[PDB]
Design a binder for this molecule. Sequence first.
Ligand SMILES: Nc1nc2c(c(=O)[nH]1)N[C@H]1C(S)=C(S)[C@@H](COP(=O)(O)OP(=O)(O)OC[C@H]3O[C@@H](n4cnc5c(=O)[nH]c(N)nc54)[C@H](O)[C@@H]3O)O[C@H]1N2
Ligand SMILES: Nc1nc2c(c(=O)[nH]1)N[C@H]1C(S)=C(S)[C@@H](COP(=O)(O)OP(=O)(O)OC[C@H]3O[C@@H](n4cnc5c(=O)[nH]c(N)nc54)[C@H](O)[C@@H]3O)O[C@H]1N2
Ligand code: SF4
Ligand code: SF4
Ligand code: SF4
Ligand code: SF4
Ligand SMILES: [S]
Ligand SMILES: [W+6]
Lengths: 974, 214
Amino acid sequence: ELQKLQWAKQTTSICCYCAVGCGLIVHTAKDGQGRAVNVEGDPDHPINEGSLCPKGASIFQLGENDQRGTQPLYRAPFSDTWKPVTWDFALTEIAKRIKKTRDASFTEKNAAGDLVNRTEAIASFGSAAMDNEECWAYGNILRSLGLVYIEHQARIXHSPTVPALAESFGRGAMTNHWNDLANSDCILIMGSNAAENHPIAFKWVLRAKDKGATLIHVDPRFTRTSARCDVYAPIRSGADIPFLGGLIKYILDNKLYFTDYVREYTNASLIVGEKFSFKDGLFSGYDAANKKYDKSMWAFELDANGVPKRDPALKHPRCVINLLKKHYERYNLDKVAAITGTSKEQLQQVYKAYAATGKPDKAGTIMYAMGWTQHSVGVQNIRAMAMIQLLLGNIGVAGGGVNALRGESNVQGSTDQGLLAHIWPGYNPVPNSKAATLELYNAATPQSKDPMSVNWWQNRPKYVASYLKALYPDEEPAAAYDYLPRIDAGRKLTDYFWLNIFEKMDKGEFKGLFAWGMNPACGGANANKNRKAMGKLEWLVNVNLFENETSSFWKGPGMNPAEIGTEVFFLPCCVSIEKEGSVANSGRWMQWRYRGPKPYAETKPDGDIMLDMFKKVRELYAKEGGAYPAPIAKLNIADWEEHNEFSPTKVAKLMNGYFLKDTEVGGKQFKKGQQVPSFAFLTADGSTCSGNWLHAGSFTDAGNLMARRDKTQTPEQARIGLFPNWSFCWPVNRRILYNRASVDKTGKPWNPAKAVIEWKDGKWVGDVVDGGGDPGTKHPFIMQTHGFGALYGPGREEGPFPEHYEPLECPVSKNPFSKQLHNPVAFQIEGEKKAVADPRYPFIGTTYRVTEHWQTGLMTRRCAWLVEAEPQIFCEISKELAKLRGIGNGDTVKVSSLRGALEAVAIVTERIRPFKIEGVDVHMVGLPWHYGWMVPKNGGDTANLLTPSAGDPNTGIPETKAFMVDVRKVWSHP
Amino acid sequence: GKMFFVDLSRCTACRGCQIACKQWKNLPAEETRNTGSHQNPPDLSYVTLKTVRFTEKSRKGPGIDWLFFPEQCRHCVEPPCKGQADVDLEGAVVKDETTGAVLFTELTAKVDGESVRSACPYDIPRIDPVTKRLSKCDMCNDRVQNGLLPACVKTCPTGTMNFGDEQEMLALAEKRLAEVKKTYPGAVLGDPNDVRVVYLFTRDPKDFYEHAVA
Ligand SMILES: Nc1nc2c(c(=O)[nH]1)N[C@H]1C(S)=C(S)[C@@H](COP(=O)(O)OP(=O)(O)OC[C@H]3O[C@@H](n4cnc5c(=O)[nH]c(N)nc54)[C@H](O)[C@@H]3O)O[C@H]1N2
Ligand SMILES: Nc1nc2c(c(=O)[nH]1)N[C@H]1C(S)=C(S)[C@@H](COP(=O)(O)OP(=O)(O)OC[C@H]3O[C@@H](n4cnc5c(=O)[nH]c(N)nc54)[C@H](O)[C@@H]3O)O[C@H]1N2
Ligand code: SF4
Ligand code: SF4
Ligand code: SF4
Ligand code: SF4
Ligand SMILES: [S]
Ligand SMILES: [W+6]
């Protein structure tokens, strides 16, 4: 056998980088007692089959890295030095600062005198990089301390996708899964670099092509994805809506929609109120003064029973499908070409190819991510594509869907666990101030009187009650509800989000920050604002693998440590392979992973760090009292622990949930202490606890379903690779969502050759059906109020149809579609100037990734094989732009915006070409944002020195993908 | 013995293979810089046995022909490197009679390294200037002798890398050549009767690398 592996124990794990969720084999020396000796792919894993991209293939170099933190370090105010300290010192002092800050900043009641019970002066950032059990424990810890400013990666990543797809379909999640790409007949990759950023996905994309699919990449750059597609079309950054509205128009004009699917399954028939109009950029109900829409102007006309009226002939002028045809009739080839840079020929070619999946037995799929989300119009970009998919019958089918590609390993899961300011675990809203009782909270939920509309959210009362009974089990739901903090009902939700946290930090309003597995000194847009802002904190707790640009902002570029009063605690955490837990992939596959080696040096898993820190805070409250100590004293944390350690297994069981009492539910009978087998059998009365309802099914009486490694399939399941016995996906192992739309009212597949489910005997066969009920008896979209795929979606801040607006910094003074240049209700901070068609910043700036690095490169900048492949910040420009600026391939260049400047090596390439925008060449400058001042030497700093703190009014995601810059040659050096 | 079939019509230049090879052998990193290309390291060296070469060529209409070449020893059926090395000292270059692997030993430090390199039609061997030892791809021969795929083949996500018996891989190379030729009319197999690493190139192999073929 192999000398290297021989006397080493083998364990299975899941890649700690992207949301594909590839399987690892780990070898640990001396049957598990020594260090990792080897990490490589798990040949048995149904997603990667042993494959790893270079980030997965280098995990050994990350885990066995002698630059890793070894113990806590403390930076005294105005100090230029780290001091080594004990966990006992570090966690007692932090507990002290938490309490001191909580006591001095606690709001029992707001201005208006409503109850809110919230800590104003502490914020938390993180983290999508933690295991699902740690994320849920972490949120509950911070909420029990009264925090409302709780944010992570999701805010600045796929936040717009959740409302965009929820509005369209009922849920915000990726609709299909990685193995399902192979079933597609046309893969459109757009706002995505999937060969670089989801590399194992390309195994399945290429397998689609092997079985007859066309692969289309639409991107402002020619990339490693583009090299391997049949069709490449350029598009200018910030011009997706025109491209997609074009395609809506092309589909409607040429009768390429799936008629039966549109009539029965979309809100096509539903009649909108005479109140709805649209004129020269603005929907009806614009309040100019306050930058806000009166959404009530967009309501459907109700019948007599409070149900939206339907004309199933599609003749009424106020049918959605007729206002759709009217809204997108401006989006003609010549206007789209003129504003995208894309030629008429290329639109025609891509439109003809995609629109052809219209047929019932064809499936087209979109793979999108940050090229669409990181925009002032991000929600509307994703809405426009959701709409196209419904017109073409691609929602619910094998090889269809909206494949919103999630980023980090557990971003799907951290979001599920409510590490965002607007949501508790399971996407139940954070209460605002009007919701003074549980009844007033639960009564927010919209009702349907349509007997065919499941409107499944109506069960929210059960999930809220089970949630409070997981936290506070010796209490009534209604009494425990008062222990949890609330936001103000009069304030835009963007007030509670990433960009406004940093704006408030920059005015002195924050005393403490947890930077828990995030690097906002490099990851946050407008990095110079953030670096100065952190200097206004009294304390900062950085939990991470390595010293970094956040931990050490006080000794960054242009900083004098002696001027900066921030106390910093750096607490070193352990890598993925040194702990047990689950991570949820883009497909909602919740996968269990085991420990290989013991934690390195004095590093600790996050669960243990946060559990220790909370106990010391509870001890301080027991001993001295202070502000509202009840939430802190009463939080059930004894269910989180075993042999004096944090217990991921017992936290998973509690997130799945269990009966506190014997009970009868769904007319079925259950013992006390029994695991809730499904969210169906949860209750509003206190009979059941469940930390996260979406987890009810994950850990039943049959064992840990996330730990299943069973590739067994029926022949129908094998035809489209569901692998329903590999781990567990939410909800209740529904692998393809909205699968009711994949059949006719009989329950026969639209594509028998690629069937998701079929009515055969008296059973649904294939996937778990997405909603109970015989064929034809229910609307297929069970999380929607009205039960339909929304073509018209009136809950969105900018309006119920996508409309093109230029980025807040744009190369045009004038918008060809309307007199509204920018998004009329865009999130912006007064006094922050915007380079609009300014000669000083004449070029489009964009930021993106490479295959070989990860996020801010905090991790991969430490990994010598990945630095070897991509050693330093580069700048991609066309030959045309390089000629204009006298820039030679390999020259040093300085890229600048209103907000900052940095140097980079120029990559002059034909892979970037100028954009003919209204007859004028517009040049683009591309930067990767993986670089930072701390390491390596000569790597460069973060592209976020350039980016603006403005963005989407629905989610506050920054516009990191489209801004304005200059580039000049730099003449320095021997 | 064994053969690689390397279908460059599927390569995303992810560099999984480049990092997989260093992980399996725990090789060090070279000190690199960006000189206006993703390519790095720029060449094979004593400590880099595989690197992905990046060439930009033109095509009609939009985009470019982006040509990815993951370079490695071809494991010649009749290796000139061994012929050259046997002139100075037998045992410096040996052949696995079972796998076909061409293998460098420590006795390479006793032979004229620059003449071994110059005898290689693919310009593959690399010398350590300190010890005068030669290195290159060793076919992950120890993994192959124990029923495992080479590190770079197991890691590959796209079906670019393929390994197995010479009969199954030559039958694969021919099947795949005929499909790729439909969508790439200049596609050719690299010296397929002479090496155990058979590349399918989508156009003139010289566009991928000057030493792509003999
Ligand atoms: N290798 C690697 N993989 C990663 C990551 C990483 O850091 N490195 N990070 C992970 C994370 S957290 C995330 S969220 C995902 C994101 O993955 P992607 O979204 O694929 O990442 P980006 O490369 O940032 O953006 C994709 C593409 O958007 C294009 N683009 C820029 N502006 C526009 C525009 O206005 N419109 C359109 N249509 N395209 C535009 C860029 O040219 C780029 O090719 O990747 C994940 N995977
Ligand atoms: N200009 C620009 N800015 C961007 C983007 C862009 O495309 N362009 N992308 C945005 C997106 S999609 C995202 S997701 C954000 C990401 O921004 P950040 O999350 O701030 O990026 P990093 O901190 O590098 O990435 C994850 C961190 O998790 C840490 N980590 C790993 N394992 C563990 C663990 O077990 N515990 C803990 N506590 N930490 C761990 C890593 O060490 C690393 O520091 O950046 C955003 N910013
Ligand atoms: S980074 Fe993503 S694609 Fe690469 S090995 Fe990890 S999970 Fe797989
Ligand atoms: S041969 Fe395979 S692993 Fe290597 S760069 Fe190409 S696709 Fe990536
Ligand atoms: S490619 Fe060169 S180094 Fe490799 S076996 Fe052939 S002659 Fe020897
Ligand atoms: S066969 Fe082994 S030694 Fe040769 S390139 Fe691949 S991983 Fe490296
Ligand atoms: S993410
Ligand atoms: W992300």
